Structures are given as structure tokens and as C-alpha cells.
Write a protein that binds this ligand. Sequence first.
Ligand SMILES: O=C(O)Cc1c[nH]c2ccccc12
Ligand SMILES: O=C(O)Cc1c[nH]c2ccccc12
Lengths: 149, 149
Amino acid sequence: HHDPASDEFRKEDFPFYWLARVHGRYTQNMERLLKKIDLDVPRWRVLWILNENGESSISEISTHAIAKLSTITKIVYRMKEDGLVDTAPSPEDGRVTQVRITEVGLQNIERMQEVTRELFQRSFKGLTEAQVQRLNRMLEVVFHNLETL
Amino acid sequence: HHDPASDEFRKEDFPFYWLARVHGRYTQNMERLLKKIDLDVPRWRVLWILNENGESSISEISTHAIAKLSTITKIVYRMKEDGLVDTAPSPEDGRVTQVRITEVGLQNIERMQEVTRELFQRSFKGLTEAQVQRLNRMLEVVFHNLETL
Ligand SMILES: O=C(O)Cc1c[nH]c2ccccc12
Ligand SMILES: O=C(O)Cc1c[nH]c2ccccc12
């Protein structure tokens, strides 16, 4: 039922169908919420990456934000204009740009934590903490499977 | 660990992080494969929707392909030029465009079934049929949860 090469294929039994539907609805709702505090999904991701990893290159940010280097560069310098991040040439390689979050960026993290609280309360309604962890593990397994292609 | 409002938040424990990573890697690999037979992810989706549901409006296609009505309209008339679909005004409402798959579209379905076979063999490696069904059910639950916002 979940095999596109089968005659029994049904999108409603196809994990990637519901994955894409979830990605789209989640993205739309997050864009709506973050707009209220002058943010968006790419800047939400960049801020979380900087908050977890400290100083980060454009390349590392791009990997974890799922965006092109050009997109991340534009977003990063926009955030720097707004005061949310600062940048500096990497000492190892002047070609490589290092980005770090500012105290204003951290305040923006607090704002995005508050404004999305209800969405994340609702998102996993009906699922236990073990079920959520199992969802997470299975998604990571699929990701690693796709990295072998 | 999976709660963005928590001090313990870690993206690697956050279902939406792995969901987005999977969506991106899956999309890139599918684009690569479908390009070999002159297709892409949006046309793969449109063909599956038409193959399952028969004659379908632009709106229904757009819902299930996760795209804007304008995007789907352009894709649909491109596919019609290439002979993969045909269109007709809906009898109920001349404003509404009905799309149906052609025998050439069905042949393209067979080609996309063949060219992605290995990706789908690899995608669920290490997961049993029950685990895949549980992944599917949990994703549908999250989707329905997000529809309440
Ligand atoms: O791109 C994918 O394979 C997932 C997907 C999203 N909408 C779809 C409609 C029909 C079949 C698959 C999909
Ligand atoms: O948009 C999301 O919430 C998922 C996501 C993708 N990359 C991320 C990096 C850090 C935190 C969340 C995400």
C-alpha cells in the first residue's frame, strides 16, 4: 500500500505523503505565528542553530536550516542589520563567514518560544512521550537511509 | 528535549527537525531521479493524484500536491502541452478546470515507478511493515493536530 511500484499504492498509506502534508501545514502555521514578531521559518531555524552550536559557518547553518548558501547568506546579513546576529571572518580561512547570535537574538528566541507555545502543545496531542520519541527515531532512520543514495 | 519552550530543547530530539531534513533529502533525490525521465516532484504528485482520483479540479490537485493554485495551473497546462493530461471546463461551473490523466500520462507513471524503485527500497530499510504503518499513522495524527490551528 505504501509502495509506489505496487498496484495497491495509496498515498494515504505512503509515509512521504503525510510527511509532505505535515511539512506544509506546519510551515504555514509557523510562518503565520512568527510573522507576528517580525520573524519567519528560516530565521527561526538560524536562531536555533546559533543558540545550540554557538559560532557557526554559513555552510553549517545552511546544512541544518535546509537552504542554499545564497539564501542563508542573505538571511544572515538581514539578521545582522536587524541586530540579531553578528559575523566575522573565520581565522582559519578568510573566505569562511562565522555567525553568532546576539543578546537581541536571544531575546528574539524568547519571543518565538512564547508565540509558538500553543502550536507545540497541539502538535503532539494524542501522542505519548514514548510515541514522540519513536516518531523522532524513525524519521532519523529514514533520513540516514536517504543519505546512502 | 523536543519542546522548543524548554531549556532542554535539542533539534535532534525535535520531530519537525528530522521531518524537514527528510523532506529536503527526499525531495533532492526524487528531483534527481525524475529529471532523468523529464519529470519532477510536482508532476510526480499530480500524476499520482490523477491516477488515484480520476478527473480532478485544480483546487483538489493543489491541496494534495501542496502547491498554490497558480503553480498547479502552470504545471497542468505544461503537462497538457506534453500530452500527459487533458483538461475540460467543469459542467457544474465553467470557472472550474477539470484535469484527467492520458494514456501517455499513465506510461509516464510506469517510468517514474521504475526509476524510483531503488530509492523506495532504500527508504524504509531497517523498518518493518508494522513500523512503517506506525510512522504513517503518527504523521497523519500530527497533520490532523495542526488542522485544529
Ligand atoms: O512527493 C511525494 O512523494 C509525497 C506526496 C505529496 N503529495 C502527494 C500526492 C500523491 C503522491 C505522493 C505525494
Ligand atoms: O522548522 C523547524 O522547526 C524544523 C527545523 C529545521 N531545521 C531546524 C534547525 C533548528 C531547529 C528546528 C529546525
